[PDB]
Amino acid sequence: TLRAAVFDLDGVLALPAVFGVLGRTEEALALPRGLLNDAFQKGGPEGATTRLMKGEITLSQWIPLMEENCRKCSETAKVCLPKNFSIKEIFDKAISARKINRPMLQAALMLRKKGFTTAILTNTWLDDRAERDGLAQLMCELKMHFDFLIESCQVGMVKPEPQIYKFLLDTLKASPSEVVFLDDIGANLKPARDLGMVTILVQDTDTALKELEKVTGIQLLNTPAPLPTSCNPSDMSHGYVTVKPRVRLHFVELGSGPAVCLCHGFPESWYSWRYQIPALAQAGYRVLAMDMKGYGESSAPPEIEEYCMEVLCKEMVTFLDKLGLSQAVFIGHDWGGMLVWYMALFYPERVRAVASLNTPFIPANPNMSPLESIKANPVFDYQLYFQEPGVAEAELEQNLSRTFKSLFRASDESVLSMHKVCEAGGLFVNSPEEPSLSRMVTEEEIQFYVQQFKKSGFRGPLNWYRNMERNWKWACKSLGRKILIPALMVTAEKDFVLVPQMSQHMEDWIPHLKRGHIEDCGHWTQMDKPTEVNQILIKWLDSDAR
Amino acid sequence: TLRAAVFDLDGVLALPAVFGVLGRTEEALALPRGLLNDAFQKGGPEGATTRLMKGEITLSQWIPLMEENCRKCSETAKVCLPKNFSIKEIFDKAISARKINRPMLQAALMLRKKGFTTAILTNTWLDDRAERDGLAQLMCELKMHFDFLIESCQVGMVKPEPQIYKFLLDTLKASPSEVVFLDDIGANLKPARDLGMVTILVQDTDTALKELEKVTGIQLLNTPAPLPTSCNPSDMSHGYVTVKPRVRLHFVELGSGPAVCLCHGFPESWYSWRYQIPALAQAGYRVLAMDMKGYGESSAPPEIEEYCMEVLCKEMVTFLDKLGLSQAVFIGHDWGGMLVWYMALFYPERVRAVASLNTPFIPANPNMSPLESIKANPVFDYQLYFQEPGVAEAELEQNLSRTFKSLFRASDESVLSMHKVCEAGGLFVNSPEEPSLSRMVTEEEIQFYVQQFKKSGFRGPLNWYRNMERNWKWACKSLGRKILIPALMVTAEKDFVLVPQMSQHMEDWIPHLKRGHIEDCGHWTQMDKPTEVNQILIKWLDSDAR
Ligand SMILES: O=C(N[C@@H]1[C@@H]2C[C@@H]3C[C@H]1C[C@@](O)(C3)C2)c1cnc(N[C@H]2CCOC2)nc1C1CCCC1
Numbered sequence A, B: 001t002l003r004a005a006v007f008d009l010d011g012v013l014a015l016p017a018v019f020g021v022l023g024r025t026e027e028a029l030a031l032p033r034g035l036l037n038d039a040f041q042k043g044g045p046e047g048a049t050t051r052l053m054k055g056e057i058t059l060s061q062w063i064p065l066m067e068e069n070c071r072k073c074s075e076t077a078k079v080c081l082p083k084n085f086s087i088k089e090i091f092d093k094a095i096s097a098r099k100i101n102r103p104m105l106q107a108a109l110m111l112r113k114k115g116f117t118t119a120i121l122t123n124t125w126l127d128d129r130a131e132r133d134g135l136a137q138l139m140c141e142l143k144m145h146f147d148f149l150i151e152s153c154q155v156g157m158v159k160p161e162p163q164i165y166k167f168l169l170d171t172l173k174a175s176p177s178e179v180v181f182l183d184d185i186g187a188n189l190k191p192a193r194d195l196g197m198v199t200i201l202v203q204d205t206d207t208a209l210k211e212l213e214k215v216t217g218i219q220l221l222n223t224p225a226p227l228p229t230s231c232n233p234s235d236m237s238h239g240y241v242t243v244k245p246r247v248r249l250h251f252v253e254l255g256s257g258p259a260v261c262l263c264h265g266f267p268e269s270w271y272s273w274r275y276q277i278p279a280l281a282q283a284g285y286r287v288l289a290m291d292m293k294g295y296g297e298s299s300a301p302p303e304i305e306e307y308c309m310e311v312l313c314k315e316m317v318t319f320l321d322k323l324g325l326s327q328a329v330f331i332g333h334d335w336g337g338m339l340v341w342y343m344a345l346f347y348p349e350r351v352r353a354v355a356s357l358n359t360p361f362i363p364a365n366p367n368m369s370p371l372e373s374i375k376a377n378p379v380f381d382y383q384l385y386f387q388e389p390g391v392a393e394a395e396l397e398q399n400l401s402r403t404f405k406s407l408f409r410a411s412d413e414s415v416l417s418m419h420k421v422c423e424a425g426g427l428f429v430n431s432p433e434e435p436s437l438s439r440m441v442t443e444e445e446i447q448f449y450v451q452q453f454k455k456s457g458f459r460g461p462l463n464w465y466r467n468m469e470r471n472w473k474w475a476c477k478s479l480g481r482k483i484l485i486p487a488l489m490v491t492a493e494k495d496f497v498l499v500p501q502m503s504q505h506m507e508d509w510i511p512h513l514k515r516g517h518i519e520d521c522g523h524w525t526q527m528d529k530p531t532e533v534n535q536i537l538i539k540w541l542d543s544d545a546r
């Protein structure tokens, strides 16, 4: 029974193969066929390329050795190398043309999800070229989806030498019959076959995956679209900033580039952005996913006034000051979305761009108190249940697992009313004791929220709703303003509280507003439709926030 | 007795003043003298500019209102505004010309160091211009040196209204006679004077500082060159990455731009980079100051082999992987400097550029064991004292305060021998029980190192020296390589162990090597000569690492 799958990089996980590109360069330069391969392989196990692949010399040390082999080959073939001949240029182009073979990576991901140990085994070099970052980025994106990365130049061995196969087996902690090995080089499969491993010669991706599908008995081709990459909390970089003596803010950080600050809703976590964090970092952004004040590993002071928007926004400004950031792109959802609009209104100099999921820009009504506004808008009547300190805390804290399983559901899986919360005296009054698990979440994901809420519970989170008068008076100071910085409003078709029509007057305040809209999406946008959220955010960030 | 000092931004902490620039624009556009000031002030307390300064409208909303005032003013003056007339362009140039008035900031810093509460009180706007980051960066650099920043547009009041002065006094928690107020606008001093504050009209910086020096009785002009900005540990963003099940690495992070990873020496801390962190962040870099493995808040496993260079380098690579960084600039000192050369040799694709303070690139001698090498080089004989587990730990842990006060001294303050450590049986055998405090450090800084070392002590730090054979065998694999990525070697004149001459053969291995050299500098480079270290590193980063 197969338990491990090994992939080569060049010609397998990354396409085109370097020598595929070079065959075309050879033809374009009108060189004799095979001259570059011949000069590359010159001396075989005793040659310059074996020294390179074993890590004895760097790629920059190897370049002139390859140039000399090309001259020797051309002299013997009685041909002249062209005037502009440069191994540096030729190899730079071949390395840069190489991109992840997405169907191959998808198959490796499916196998690992099904319990396989996966590895990359590659003949590679120590890259010290001025352009080395390109290949470093590619390797970084690939390696994180595998249990092991074995590089010839780091282990001092190369394929097809038999010792590297014994090293692979030792690394995998598996017998050869438990391994499936994929390579586009027939001579590199021979030692693996020799030991008793299943081997697949990768000539074309589709045929190779068909052989892999048959031997593993796992569907790899024609599969449903996979979810974006998620986060394992224990593998993230965790950051902590004290904004004031009693308040520290926790965040998860990933990537490099413009800072993108993600602000979750109620009652959530930095983990609500799990499908966005890897995607936004891969897209070229430095992601800062907050635990907002009152949540997770951030401080949760008991006082209501610690959660008014003016205080919360001031603290987010301090957060940027202490990290040494003049600006960040602010992306919010739900209560986070409300906060980000207000960051754009009061601190535009610190906000590079602003985006909200579901929450429209809600201006203060100077002619009505927030309680009179709730009276005139009964879709928000449930917020009255959140007013009295202790009442909603008692219901939400009674059974954390039940709380999160009842809340985090798709539009069609709703177990909550919302419209009759006050009349019924609670959120879960007509909800089951043991709700089924939504198709959106796994039991493990639910238990992470349960664990997070065991620290401070719901007092801090509910206090976000307990500052209506303070928030109203503060928001009234901004009534003569317009939001003129780059802005995106994303609506969700099936959010029955934050309906898309609630955002219809936003252009009155934000004239240059850009929009996104997600079909068949409920309230929990990030986990309901992660692929769609990612596409919308990346397109907008790349056009408006760079 | 004066206890607080208040500074204006425009024309005081930042020069030139906006209207200084505009006087020149007026003349260049051949406009009637005072037309821009007149259109700017139009309507006084009821005008567009008062609304802007109170935060009622944003700068972008104000721009066309100012344009209309300019048209009204030109019509009345019977003049035509030029064809190319643009308030947007005119104001963008004036805002961008404004730079920190370094002598004024220096004086504010001296007063705060002497116990004054300091504040910035400014007539400012909500900046939503596409170019707003310029001013956001300036305000960010300035505000962090002050106890308070009071902005007209955030408080809804403007100078010279009397209420803003009462607000200032409430914020300061001081009586008016305890305050010195500096402003370049005479009408803005009148309400402060009216309340009983000391006022200084800032016409020229030198004269204003002379008045300030006389009234406070504190020397502000002609002072010695101040030290660079340091770090207060409780105000930094602290980051934590698990690199493997039992190992977590702690770092302090500040700034945005290319990642710069700072690697301290033995027996140090992230805090050894305190004078570099703010300077490198201000210079346009994202600084990651490590607690290296075995130190501070990073893990300190007991096993010797956990501290061999191969393991330490692999972990730093994992650190980059988990943070989502394809590369970082690696800057090391002492043991950190040794590690960074090896990162450049084994992982060039992950190293954007490399710099070492004091530690030359030390290649392995394949013909001698590291013990035979120490026998032939007695300057390193003291390292034999570090070999036996427990011996050096007992001496270094006996009295932490004595340990750090004896080690951290200028070249001329040495209390250690080094050349007779083995013969004498310890580092502090002929050192006083109560050493004096070096001119390099304060008691508070010493106590931070004492606190850090109470967690894990010296076992992990000393284990860095206990892997000579493993490190030698690993380093031998790199003997055919050259370091061809951007590299800087900084020598210290008076480091009597890591002498500048020890770096003399480095060009044999690093042909494109760049150099720095610091006169009258001992071993503890970062704190001995911080201004010089900062100048050298920033110049090199800006030329070779961007
Ligand atoms: O690894 C290869 N060659 C090795 C070198 C040279 C020789 C033979 C082996 C072992 C050595 O020790 C000696 C080091 C090798 C062999 N064939 C192909 N392409 C094939 C697929 C398409 O075109 C041919 N590509 C490579 C490298 C993979 C990354 C860059 C090229």
Ligand SMILES: O=C(N[C@@H]1[C@@H]2C[C@@H]3C[C@H]1C[C@@](O)(C3)C2)c1cnc(N[C@H]2CCOC2)nc1C1CCCC1
Residues within 6 Å of the ligand: A266, A267, A334, A335, A338, A359, A362, A407, A414, A416, A418, A495, A496, A497, A498, A523
């Ligand atoms: O209360 C909500 N959001 C906040 C309100 C309204 C808006 C957005 C934020 C911040 C506000 O300031 C403005 C106050 C809110 C909004 N929409 C939904 N959609 C439900 C549909 C089914 O699942 C949840 N649910 C909630 C709560 C989340 C759990 C219990 C109800």
Ligand SMILES: O=C(N[C@@H]1[C@@H]2C[C@@H]3C[C@H]1C[C@@](O)(C3)C2)c1cnc(N[C@H]2CCOC2)nc1C1CCCC1
Residues within 6 Å of the ligand: A361, A362, A363, A365, A370, A373, A374, A377, A380, A383, A502, A503, A505
């Ligand atoms: O939904 C509103 N306010 C919020 C509700 C009720 C209150 C106050 C805020 C925050 C809440 O949490 C509590 C949720 C609300 C209230 N009044 C008006 N317009 C008014 C002016 C013209 O006609 C009515 N508009 C809105 C939304 C903004 C555009 C479409 C609807």
Ligand SMILES: O=C(N[C@@H]1[C@@H]2C[C@@H]3C[C@H]1C[C@@](O)(C3)C2)c1cnc(N[C@H]2CCOC2)nc1C1CCCC1
Residues within 6 Å of the ligand: B010, B011, B017, B018, B019, B020, B040, B041, B044, B045, B049, B050, B053, B123, B158, B159, B160, B184, B185
């Ligand atoms: O704050 C100023 N004016 C105020 C506006 C307009 C008027 C008068 C006050 C109070 C207002 O409410 C009404 C708002 C004001 C006054 N004088 C000068 N420059 C001086 C130094 C060099 O040139 C003149 N500069 C300013 C501003 C400081 C930043 C941008 C210009």
Ligand SMILES: O=C(N[C@@H]1[C@@H]2C[C@@H]3C[C@H]1C[C@@](O)(C3)C2)c1cnc(N[C@H]2CCOC2)nc1C1CCCC1
Residues within 6 Å of the ligand: B266, B267, B334, B335, B338, B359, B362, B407, B414, B416, B418, B495, B496, B497, B498, B523
């Ligand atoms: O041991 C040192 N550094 C390491 C050695 C030598 C070099 C650099 C690192 C890493 C090595 O691998 C290579 C091993 C080392 C180097 N120079 C000095 N200069 C003294 C002068 C007065 O103050 C300290 N001091 C030390 C120790 C620091 C406290 C006790 C002695």
Ligand SMILES: O=C(N[C@@H]1[C@@H]2C[C@@H]3C[C@H]1C[C@@](O)(C3)C2)c1cnc(N[C@H]2CCOC2)nc1C1CCCC1
Residues within 6 Å of the ligand: B361, B362, B363, B365, B370, B373, B374, B377, B380, B383, B502, B503, B505
């Ligand atoms: O200092 C050396 N090695 C280190 C010392 C001794 C041992 C080994 C390393 C690391 C230590 O921690 C322990 C400190 C050392 C040893 N041997 C040689 N060259 C040899 C080849 C030609 O002549 C001698 N060169 C050096 C330095 C590199 C250039 C100038 C001096």
